Amino acid sequence: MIKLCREVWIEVNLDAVKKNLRAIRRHIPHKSKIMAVVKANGYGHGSIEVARHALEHGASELAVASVEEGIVLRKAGITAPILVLGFTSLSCVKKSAAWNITLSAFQVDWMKEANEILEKEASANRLAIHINVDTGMGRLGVRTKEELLEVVKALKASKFLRWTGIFTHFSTADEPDTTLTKLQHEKFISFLSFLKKQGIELPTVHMCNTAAAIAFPEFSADMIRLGIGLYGLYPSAYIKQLNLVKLEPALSLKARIAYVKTMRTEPRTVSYGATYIAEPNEVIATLPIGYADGYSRALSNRGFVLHRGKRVPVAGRVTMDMIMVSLGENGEGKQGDEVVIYGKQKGAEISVDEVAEMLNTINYEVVSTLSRRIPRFYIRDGEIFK
Amino acid sequence: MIKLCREVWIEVNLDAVKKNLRAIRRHIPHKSKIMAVVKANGYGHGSIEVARHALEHGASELAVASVEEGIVLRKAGITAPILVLGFTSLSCVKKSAAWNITLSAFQVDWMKEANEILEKEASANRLAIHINVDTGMGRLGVRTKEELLEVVKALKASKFLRWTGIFTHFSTADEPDTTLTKLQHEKFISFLSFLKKQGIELPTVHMCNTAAAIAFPEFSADMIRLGIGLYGLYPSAYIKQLNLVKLEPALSLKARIAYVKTMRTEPRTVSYGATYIAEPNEVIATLPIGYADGYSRALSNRGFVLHRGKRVPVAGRVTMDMIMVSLGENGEGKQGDEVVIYGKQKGAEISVDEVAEMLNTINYEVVSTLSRRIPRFYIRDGEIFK
Numbered sequence: 001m002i003k004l005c006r007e008v009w010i011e012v013n014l015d016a017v018k019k020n021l022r023a024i025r026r027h028i029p030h031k032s033k034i035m036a037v038v039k040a041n042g043y044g045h046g047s048i049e050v051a052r053h054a055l056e057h058g059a060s061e062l063a064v065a066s067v068e069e070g071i072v073l074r075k076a077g078i079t080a081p082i083l084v085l086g087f088t089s090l091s092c093v094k095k096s097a098a099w100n101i102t103l104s105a106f107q108v109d110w111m112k113e114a115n116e117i118l119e120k121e122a123s124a125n126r127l128a129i130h131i132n133v134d135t136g137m138g139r140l141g142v143r144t145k146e147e148l149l150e151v152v153k154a155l156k157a158s159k160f161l162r163w164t165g166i167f168t169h170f171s172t173a174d175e176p177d178t179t180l181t182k183l184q185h186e187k188f189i190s191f192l193s194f195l196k197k198q199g200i201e202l203p204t205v206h207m208c209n210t211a212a213a214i215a216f217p218e219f220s221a222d223m224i225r226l227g228i229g230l231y232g233l234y235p236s237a238y239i240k241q242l243n244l245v246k247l248e249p250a251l252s253l254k255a256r257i258a259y260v261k262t263m264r265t266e267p268r269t270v271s272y273g274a275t276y277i278a279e280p281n282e283v284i285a286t287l288p289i290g291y292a293d294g295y296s297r298a299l300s301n302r303g304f305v306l307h308r309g310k311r312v313p314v315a316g317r318v319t320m321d322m323i324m325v326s327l328g329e330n331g332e333g334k335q336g337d338e339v340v341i342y343g344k345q346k347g348a349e350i351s352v353d354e355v356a357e358m359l360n361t362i363n364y365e366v367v368s369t370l371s372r373r374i375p376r377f378y379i380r381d382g383e384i385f386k
Numbered sequence: 387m388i389k390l391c392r393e394v395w396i397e398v399n400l401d402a403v404k405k406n407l408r409a410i411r412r413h414i415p416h417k418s419k420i421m422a423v424v425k426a427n428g429y430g431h432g433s434i435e436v437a438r439h440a441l442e443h444g445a446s447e448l449a450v451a452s453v454e455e456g457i458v459l460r461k462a463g464i465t466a467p468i469l470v471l472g473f474t475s476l477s478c479v480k481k482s483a484a485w486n487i488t489l490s491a492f493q494v495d496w497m498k499e500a501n502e503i504l505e506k507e508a509s510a511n512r513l514a515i516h517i518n519v520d521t522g523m524g525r526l527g528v529r530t531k532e533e534l535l536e537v538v539k540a541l542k543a544s545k546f547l548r549w550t551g552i553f554t555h556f557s558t559a560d561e562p563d564t565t566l567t568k569l570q571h572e573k574f575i576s577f578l579s580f581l582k583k584q585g586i587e588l589p590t591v592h593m594c595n596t597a598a599a600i601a602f603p604e605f606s607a608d609m610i611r612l613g614i615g616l617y618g619l620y621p622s623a624y625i626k627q628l629n630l631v632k633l634e635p636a637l638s639l640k641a642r643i644a645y646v647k648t649m650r651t652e653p654r655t656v657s658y659g660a661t662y663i664a665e666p667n668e669v670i671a672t673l674p675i676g677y678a679d680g681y682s683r684a685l686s687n688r689g690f691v692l693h694r695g696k697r698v699p700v701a702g703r704v705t706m707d708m709i710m711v712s713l714g715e716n717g718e719g720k721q722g723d724e725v726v727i728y729g730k731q732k733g734a735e736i737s738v739d740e741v742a743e744m745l746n747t748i749n750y751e752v753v754s755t756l757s758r759r760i761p762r763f764y765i766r767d768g769e770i771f772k
């Protein structure tokens with residue numbers, strides 16, 4: 001059984017991750033590759049072990065937010081292609097080439113200056129580059145056909161750079177009204193056919209996120225980018241309710257009860273602000289998780305955890321490192337009992353989606369804000385490690 | 387200047403931290419020591435460098451959330467007392483004793499069992515213990531004077547344990563109604579008096595947090611626990627309004643613009659959900675911070691950042707790693723320009739307190755949820771380092 005000083009931990013089930021990959025693989029066209037998106041520390045699941053498992057069970061490339069995230073994976077021994085999705089400063093062009101990291105760019109000047117850096121160097125390898133086409137997300141990427149062609153010509157003329165992909169991003173593919181998504185797809189195809197008409201051969205084309213891979217598998221082209229779905233979470237209720245792919249949540253968040261007491265004596269005030277007053281016979285359990293772990297303070301007097309298969313409420317405010325929950329007047333319970341904060345216990349469940357609804361946010365945020373001070377354990381073939 | 391691949395960072399001004407410690411030292415009784423509270427990675431500031439600086443400029447001891455947090459500080463070469471404020475499992479008693487980490491406890495059985503473990507392992511070090519008295523926070527601690535007396539006796543009969551402190555925590559010391567705080571104080575003093583009448587000599591007594599230290603310096607006893615104030619942030623508007631001590635905020639959060647564009651062509655939708663539509667001559671700047679950094683998704687179409695001394699609004703939804711802001715029609719801004727996300731720029735300021743207000747939370751949560759993937763730089767004697 002796990003031995004911790006501070007008894008709060010994450011369990012990431014890699015069997016579930018395998019099934020999720022397999023479910024998406026079985027759904028999109030046979031020829032289409034999967035790029036596993038493991039940015040923000042694997043959406044809080046741990047980038048390294050999730051990347052490793054994915055590359056073994058259906059994924060061939062990885063995506064991250066930064067060169068630094070890519071370097072973490074390289075240091076763990078991962079050799080698969082790694083794409084940086086955001087902007088990389090020219091000060092890191094040399095480093096990205098040394099570490100065989102693929103960068104996103106979309107500007108003539110960036111291609112030319114990056115090529116110039118490498119030229120000046122004893123550079124025995126070309127830096128791989130994907131071009132980002134902005135078809136409506138309005139975040140990064142080139143937005144016109146004429147500028148796309150100039151960027152492609154600059155990249156091709158840059159002998160120390162190598163074009164290995166071209167992509168766009170869907171901003172509303174998880175929504176019931178598909179009008180903007182169809183316009184984005186049409187625009188992306190039109191830019192690509194424009195390049196082909198110039199005599200240009202296209203590298204790897206990718207455009208789908210989890211939502212579009214599920215709702216528009218016909219858009220999978222050479223490769224999709226599997227994010228939220230890898231972790232067994234749906235990009236929106238609408239996509240989940242389409243019932244096209246069965247995903248299993250990989251993450252659970254657990255703790256052990258640190259102390260249990262009956263509130264016999266006065267004051268029966270609980271936690272900061274004394275916003276909660278216990279009954280004389282009420283049992284309060286203290287748990288070693290708080291808002292610095294990523295357990296939102298807005299769950300003060302609102303959240304629930306699972307203990308012995310039942311939902312028990314957060315009592316009073318969430319503090320930085322601890323919460324208190326009521327086991328009721330008696331609330332049978334002992335120091336050391338296991339509680340589930342996110343996940344399943346007996347027949348009961350508090351899903352990350354339910355937590356996100358309560359907080360008016362999305363499951364993406366709930367998992368990707370889990371602090372690195374919570375240790376992560378991994379389940380593979382029904383056994384636990386790491 | 388700073389060179390990053392992903393151009394987002396934190397600056398922690400240790401000159402301000404020094405000035406904050408000095409203002410509390412000058413306010414509380416000369417004889418009272420200061421325990422600097424550096425759990426949760428130094429309230430997201432970085433525990434090591436804040437602890438080192440505090441100990442050079444007035445603090446005598448440190449507090450953390452867990453043994454693991456205390457061990458990080460020992461490994462940094464720190465020799466000062468380190469108290470674990472929360473519950474430590476008996477599985478870590480051996481380890482805590484070896485690293486000279488002080489644990490809080492408050493139950494007879496825990497004391498007796500911890501002593502037995504250390505006996506059985508022929509521990510070359512005694513374990514330092516503080517006793518937590520729960521006088522109304524309802525989180526951890528012993529709640530009756532009779533119970534307290536049995537805990538003390540058990541600790542004292544435990545030759546492998548060493549009593550070095552006794553404390554309580556105020557749940558409402560930062561509020562205008564002082565009734566609860568005065569009742570806690572009175573109860574604490576009554577419990578301590580009970581022990582003395584038994585002839586017990588008291589170790590180091592501490593009860594004040596930042597709030598009580600400012601509003602009730604006469605309760606400073608042998609030592610206070612300086613947390614939020616160390617970082618130049620007040621525990622509540624009310625305490626700040628008392629105007630008794632001058633604190634300077636130590637943390638700022640900055641980025642450089644990753645890309646700038648005029649939204650000449652359609653569609654002019656920005657970010658997920660297409661919740662924002664730009665004008666044809668409107669300038670949109672993209673920044674490498676997002677909600678997995680701890681920049682709340684609830685700032686979507688609401689937050690502000692500083693660019694060239696002026697507030698510019700978040701446009702559309704916050705994404706996992708990036709945000710977009712509007713520089714307005716024909717607005718001036720270039721890739722590489724520095725933006726301040728939390729802090730000051732030219733005449734302007736977006737304080738952590740103002741962000742916390744926007745989000746209906748408190749400054750403690752805003753700073754302590756800043757992801758460790760943001761690098762921290764430190765300013766000391768006016769110059770940067772890491």
Ligand SMILES: *Cc1c(COP(=O)(O)O)cnc(C)c1O
Nearest residue numbers: 037085169209210225226227228
């Ligand atoms: C984060 C991200 C993804 C993965 O998206 P999911 O919605 O999680 O599947 C794909 N593409 C881009 C450009 C991203 O930023």
Ligand SMILES: *Cc1c(COP(=O)(O)O)cnc(C)c1O
Nearest residue numbers: 423471555595596611612613614
């Ligand atoms: C975190 C903490 C402190 C520091 O409190 P501030 O409000 O930040 O000054 C003091 N005491 C205890 C018991 C704590 O957990």
Ligand SMILES: [Cl-]
Nearest residue numbers: 137139140169
């Ligand atoms: Cl993008």
Ligand SMILES: [Cl-]
Nearest residue numbers: 523525526555
């Ligand atoms: Cl407490």
Ligand SMILES: [Mg+2]
Nearest residue numbers: 371372757758
């Ligand atoms: Mg973190």
Ligand SMILES: [Mg+2]
Nearest residue numbers: 412413414630
């Ligand atoms: Mg004075």
Ligand SMILES: [Mg+2]
Nearest residue numbers: 369680682755
């Ligand atoms: Mg948060």
